[PDB]
């Protein structure tokens, strides 16, 4: 299930001119463009090797759409301050998330759009892509404004049409990188923490995509609560993750780690061995 | 590709 996503962040900095504005695009778990407001001449520039070939027409367009969004997000941040009756002195955050997903057939499966204000759900484009969901009664004035303006129509047209068209083009341009499944290299490590307990850590290294399931089990069934670490980038496009379980010292060989990844034809079972 | 329009809240 392939996806084209963009993550937009606008942070108001009162007195210090216009808000900070950052736009980043993703195909699946691979960033490919970015627009940062901090520059004398800020532009949309490539952030994947396969995106270098595209022309001025593409970058000029993507630059204009990005700087037009920043401008609208500056008005949005003024408006939201008004809705919540907040001080003009304080810094506030507007986040915008949108993407289109392809199904197994390789056709449009679904689109989504959300706004958040100060790291909390504000306004959500509904499944139909023709109506919104206000989570606060403040977002209600935004819903009525968007319905009046028929915003959801122009978003629907992008998500269903433009988004699907270009996700295909990106998936073609450097498929060598995007369509390659990289299985996790997996091992168990052991770390005594006390006299009576040791940590068993299940490693998943150099895997893509980011999606992975690490779970600990004990032979003939008390397993303690797994410490699952936030999946992290290696910096080369692949991802790393570990799942730890605190365990009585001497009993390490009873516990099995189970790794599920798209790039593994069947699930992998690991067991610590001295 | 970016959407040409951003919703005005």
């Amino acid at each position, epitope marked *: 299930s392939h996806s084209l996503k963009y993550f937009h962040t606008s942070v108001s900095r009162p007195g210090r001119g216009e808000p900070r504005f950052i736009s980043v695009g993703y195909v699946d778990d691979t960033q490919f463009v970015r627009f940062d407001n901090d520059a004398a001449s800020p532009r949309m520039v490539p952030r994947a090797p396969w995106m270098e070939q595209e022309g001025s027409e593409y970058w000029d367009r993507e630059t204009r759409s990005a700087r037009d969004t920043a401008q609208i997000f500056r008005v949005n941040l*003024r408006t939201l301050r008004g809705y919540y009756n907040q001080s003009e002195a304080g810094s506030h955050t507007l986040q915008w998330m949108h993407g289109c997903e392809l199904g197994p057939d390789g056709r449009f499966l679904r689109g989504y759009e959300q706004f958040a204000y100060d790291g909390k759900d504000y306004l959500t484009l509904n499944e139909d892509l023709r109506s919104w969901t206000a989570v606060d009664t403040a977002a209600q004035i935004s819903e009525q404004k968007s319905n009046d*303006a028929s915003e959801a129509e122009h978003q629907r047209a992008y998500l269903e049409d433009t988004c699907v068209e270009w996700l295909h083009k990106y998936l073609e341009k450097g498929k060598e990188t995007l369509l390659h499944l990289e299985p996790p290299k997996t091992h168990v490590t052991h770390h005594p923490i006390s006299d009576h307990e040791a940590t068993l850590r299940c490693w998943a290294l150099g895997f893509y995509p980011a999606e992975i399931t690490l779970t600990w089990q004990q032979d003939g069934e008390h397993t303690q609560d797994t410490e699952l670490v936030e999946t992290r980038p290696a910096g080369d496009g692949t991802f790393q993750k570990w799942a730890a379980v605190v365990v009585p010292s001497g009993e390490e060989q009873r516990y099995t780690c189970h790794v599920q990844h798209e790039g593994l034809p069947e699930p992998v079972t690991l067991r610590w061995k001295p | 590709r970016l959407p040409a*329009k951003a919703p005005l809240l």
Partner: T-cell receptor, first 115, second 112 residues
Framework: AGVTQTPKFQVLKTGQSMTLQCSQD?????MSWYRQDPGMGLRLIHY???????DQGEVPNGYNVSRSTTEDFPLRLLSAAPSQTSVYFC??????????????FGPGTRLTVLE | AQEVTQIPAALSVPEGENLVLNCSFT??????LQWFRQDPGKGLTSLLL?????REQTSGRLNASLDKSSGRSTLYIAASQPGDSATYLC???????????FGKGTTLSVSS
């Protein structure tokens, strides 16, 4: 009420600096500057979506604007050139996207630049 | 970009006759279409505004229709009078929906 523009006529020598005045008392967030030539009608010079926010239009070069207030949106010619001979129209609207879309125009400023 | 064309560019008709002014625009994704009249030596006065969600707007002898899909607007002028003589300008919202883009207008002359 409505949109005000001064002056109505103006002759400039090439290289002279001149500010075309525009204001509205309708508390409109959205204001714009257009030039009308006998050929190819109205082209956008600069536009504003609120106080302190300004951006380039279709033919921005040779022109500056500032939006210090909701009321005022002056157009500045830094160095006047004969090609900037045209009629200049200031326009405001309560909204660009919503139902209150009605755009109001000023009476227009005729300007000819001579060497 | 967004390119607005107005067909015809010049039209001269005897009074009492029905006539149509057209407006085509390259990008169908617009919020609002607006028709203006320009009397010589003066500015634009807005005749009609059609939201994306609306199909037509009437104002006396003037009915404007909006075909988003085909990217067209038709202003029908019923029983033309000499007082209709002017330049008629069509405008739609730009790509970003922050300002109006104008066609080059239609010069109308209703002969007495």
């Amino acid at each position: 009420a409505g949109v005000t523009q001064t002056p109505k006529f103006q002759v400039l020598k090439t290289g002279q600096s001149m500010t075309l005045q525009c204001s509205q008392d309708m508390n409109h967030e959205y204001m714009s500057w257009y030039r009308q030539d006998p050929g190819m009608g109205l082209r956008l010079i600069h536009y504003s979506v609120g106080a302190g926010i300004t951006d380039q239009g279709e033919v921005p070069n040779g022109y500056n604007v500032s939006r210090s207030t909701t009321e005022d949106f002056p157009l500045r010619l830094l160095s006047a050139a004969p090609s900037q001979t045209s009629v200049y129209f200031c326009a405001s609207s309560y909204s660009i996207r919503g139902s209150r879309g009605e755009q109001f125009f000023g009476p227009g400023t005729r300007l000819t630049v001579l060497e | 970009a967004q390119e607005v064309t107005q067909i015809p560019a010049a039209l001269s008709v005897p009074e009492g006759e029905n006539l149509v002014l057209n407006c085509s625009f390259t990008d169908s994704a617009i919020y609002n279409l607006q028709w203006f009249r320009q009397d010589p030596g003066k500015g634009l006065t807005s005749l009609l505004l059609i939201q994306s969600s609306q199909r037509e707007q009437t104002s006396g002898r003037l009915n404007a229709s909006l075909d988003k899909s085909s990217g067209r607007s038709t202003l029908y002028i019923a029983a033309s009078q000499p007082g209709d003589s002017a330049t008629y300008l069509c405008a739609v919202t730009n790509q970003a929906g922050t300002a109006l883009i104008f066609g080059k207008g239609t010069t109308l002359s209703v002969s007495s």
